[PDB]
Write a protein that binds this ligand. Structure first.
Ligand SMILES: O=c1ccn([C@H]2C[C@H](O)[C@@H](COP(=O)(O)O)O2)c(=O)[nH]1
Ligand SMILES: O=c1ccn([C@H]2C[C@H](O)[C@@H](COP(=O)(O)O)O2)c(=O)[nH]1
Ligand SMILES: O=c1ccn([C@H]2C[C@H](O)[C@@H](COP(=O)(O)O)O2)c(=O)[nH]1
Ligand SMILES: [Mg+2]
Ligand SMILES: [Mg+2]
Lengths: 138, 139, 140
């Protein structure tokens, strides 16, 4: 099985480890490692720190995906979804939440704001050609 | 060879089954299983039912992705894209469309509003460490 | 061995070929093969040509993913992210940008606007059933 090393920064010690809700969940939940609650006005973005520093193994990546509950109930989503967490990233993972609703939103301390999904990547060799004909065409 | 079991709810029994458009398309067509045409004002979001209950096989997941056509022509996109459909999900798959254009948009009966891509997802074993490896890109 | 084949058009012959910024980078750089800068009005979308024509291997696909820096510093993103590039696509790949910030953005010619990630896609056979297996998650 693939192992995922996670190191909890000072502002993520009291919060629980990212875990799977169900034995067939696709991703681990990400929490807002914030001090005081955060107020997100409509139509602007906010950089929320998670307090996690991960070692994603070779051949795999991390994807910061939105939470379906926060998206429908409050109009909140991850701006750059799917956030590409490269396997060689050693800094603090951060989530860019943006409010596409027309009404104020508040994110509390330790609230699940996104989900990190670990998936295999295919690194391709790039060659320039001068392509095959298909039925889909252009 | 992998199979996908789909149960069509009564409001999706008349609509056609999800099918790959081309012999090498990546996703299935997701249709709005609604009776009346839906109007989405600018900056509005709607939860549209598909009438579909999926049996995504173990080791694979479902991703609700936006349509390139509706995105450019009208500004419609999936709010939680890529919408994660877990393998053990037995509920009715729903789609959250948001109108990020400047005009009102109408979603008609059984209209292609998203695409569902089946892709392999990797279950990992979470392990907490006190130090990570120093690496090229750094922070 | 996996191989991605790219045919470049005249308006994208001077840009560097899409490559990985780091040996462990997930996605290739996608650049705007345009002429003049782009007047990105807030809350407006645009269709940018890259000048690339790809031949993705069967069972694989390409994904247009937003850049993190452009999303935080200027509020730009790919509207249809992730942009599904089908394996049988033989046309020019285009990127749909959109401004979600409160300032106008200027897009330079050849500037990195998104990343292209190659990932394996699984073809599946749609067999309609009258019952799905019971799980612990249940009907969510
Ligand atoms: O939502 C996100 C997306 C990317 N990241 C990380 C993952 C990568 O190491 C960098 C991307 O830096 P770049 O200059 O865009 O290649 O940011 C993040 O922390 N949160
Ligand atoms: O756009 C979406 C995203 C998720 N779902 C389904 C698939 C997931 O297993 C359930 C539960 O979502 P959750 O991430 O646990 O809030 O919702 C959906 O029907 N449509
Ligand atoms: O962001 C994107 C998404 C799709 N495309 C292209 C490549 C895909 O094979 C086609 C899909 O177009 P469609 O008419 O939705 O099937 O569009 C693109 O150039 N940029
Ligand atoms: Mg098109
Ligand atoms: Mg950065």
């Amino acid at each position: 099985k693939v192992i995922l090393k996670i190191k909890r920064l000072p502002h993520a010690q009291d919060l629980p480890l990212p875990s799977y809700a169900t034995p067939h969940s696709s991703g681990l939940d990400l929490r807002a490692a914030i001090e005081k609650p955060l107020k997100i006005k409509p139509f602007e973005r906010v950089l929320i720190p998670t307090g996690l520093i991960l070692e994603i193994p070779e051949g795999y990546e991390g994807q910061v995906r939105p939470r379906s509950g926060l998206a429908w109930k409050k109009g909140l989503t991850v701006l750059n979804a799917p956030g590409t967490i490269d396997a060689d990233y050693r800094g603090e993972v951060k989530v860019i939440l943006v409010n596409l609703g027309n009404e104020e939103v508040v994110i509390e301390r330790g609230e699940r704001i996104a989900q990190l999904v670990i998936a295999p990547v295919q690194r391709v060799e790039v060659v320039e050609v001068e392509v095959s004909q298909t039925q889909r065409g252009e």
